[PDB]
Write a protein that binds this DNA or RNA. Sequence first.
DNA 1: CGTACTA
DNA 2: TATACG
Lengths: 257, 255
Amino acid sequence: AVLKIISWNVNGLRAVHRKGFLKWFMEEKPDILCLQEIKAAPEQLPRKLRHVEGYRSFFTPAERKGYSGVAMYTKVPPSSLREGFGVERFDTEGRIQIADFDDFLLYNIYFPNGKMSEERLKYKLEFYDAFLEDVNRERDSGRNVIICGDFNTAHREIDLARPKENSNVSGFLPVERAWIDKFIENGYVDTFRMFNSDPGQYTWWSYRTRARERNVGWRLDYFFVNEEFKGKVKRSWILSDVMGSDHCPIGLEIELL
Amino acid sequence: AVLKIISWNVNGLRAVHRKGFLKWFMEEKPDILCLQEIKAAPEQLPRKLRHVEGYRSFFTPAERKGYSGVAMYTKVPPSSLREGFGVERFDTEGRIQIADFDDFLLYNIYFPNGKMSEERLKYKLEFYDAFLEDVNRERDSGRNVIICGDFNTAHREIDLARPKENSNVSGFLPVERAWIDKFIENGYVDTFRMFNSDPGQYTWWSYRTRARERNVGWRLDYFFVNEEFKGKVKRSWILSDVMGSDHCPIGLEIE
DNA sequence: CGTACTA
DNA sequence: TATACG
Ligand SMILES: [Mg+2]
Ligand SMILES: [Mg+2]
């Protein structure tokens, strides 16, 4: 078994759908598709999206309508699916999908964006904390984990185009980058950096300035594995030619069974 | 005393502010201003709006941020300010302001818009019902009432430009007009219709089609009084030259 | 069409 | 620059 996972902040599932999302979905082989920021409730979605031939679909919308929300399409059915950490305020924004595939638990997370206010930045860092405890608790019991999605933070100065300009901007705060440091220090690997040391490798670009054309950008989307499972990751790349969102999709291949 | 009350769906207080709301407010000099669809929380408003020289301000925002909300500016201070009917689902949308001025209670209400879904249309009609019980309970027990704001419904075919086309559109449903009938039947007067019998008199126009230029429009904003208090209403007109919103302001003068 | 929220 | 509800 050589399995394939794609992660992508679509910035509106209905939006990408109108830009031919389904056609690209067939174009690819993905054994599991993780989507962040779908901005919809299942009922609001066209039937052709709700049900894709060969896939079982799961949707976790935010309580607040048309905001946040994550989704998962899968070819192999999961054992179970958890939708929160067990903390009321964190579970209701539709940012969490934890899917048991026996071999590994798959974390599909849309991490909070801090840019908006200092009030919301607090939420982000406490989300991070809630996240670590959760992933650790499961890794502690011996389970392998794959963590994907939009972390809303570039880690190192190489992970974005304008590091010096943005050191005061949320998404590159010292307190934010310090957490990813801590996160990796807890026994988790940035799967992308295992195979690629080059700068200029980004996953998000600003719409406001037509940034993507320059390739001025940020790496905000990551695949992480616990180091114990590190041996089984064959590929970790950035599908940076796929359009339709301010993010591009990212891919992981695992060698299994 | 001759007392002047203006009611207006501003369609975003911040928005009209940027179109010079305060300058009109200054020039018109009303004794009480009632505003609907403020679309803001007090914290989000510029300080120059939050407080105005000579006026005491009250804000009732919806729980849901940047949606609905009503506001009141007043030169006379009230004995009380109730913000709901006592029904959880109706009180959490910032649609209700009831202000005691001794002589009369002032109702500043932003009635729900039904156009969006049948699910929300249910809410509207149940809002109406909650509203009647409330206004009746107060008047039955000897208080005079002034009810102003956006009712989101034209009453009669004269109250809008395209009645036949819109008989299926929410805002002119029979279920809705039947309620205003019931409402008036309960001893309340459409103060505007006391002084003006003419058609073409409207308060809302659609943005989508540049309708206001034609004067294709609907009368959705009303001043109502209980008939016992009817004698004290001197004027009830439509300030239809004041721009900045899809609604225009309406005015009442009392004694 | 236009106001607002959030990214 | 790019979902909601009037
Ligand atoms: Mg986004
Ligand atoms: Mg409006």
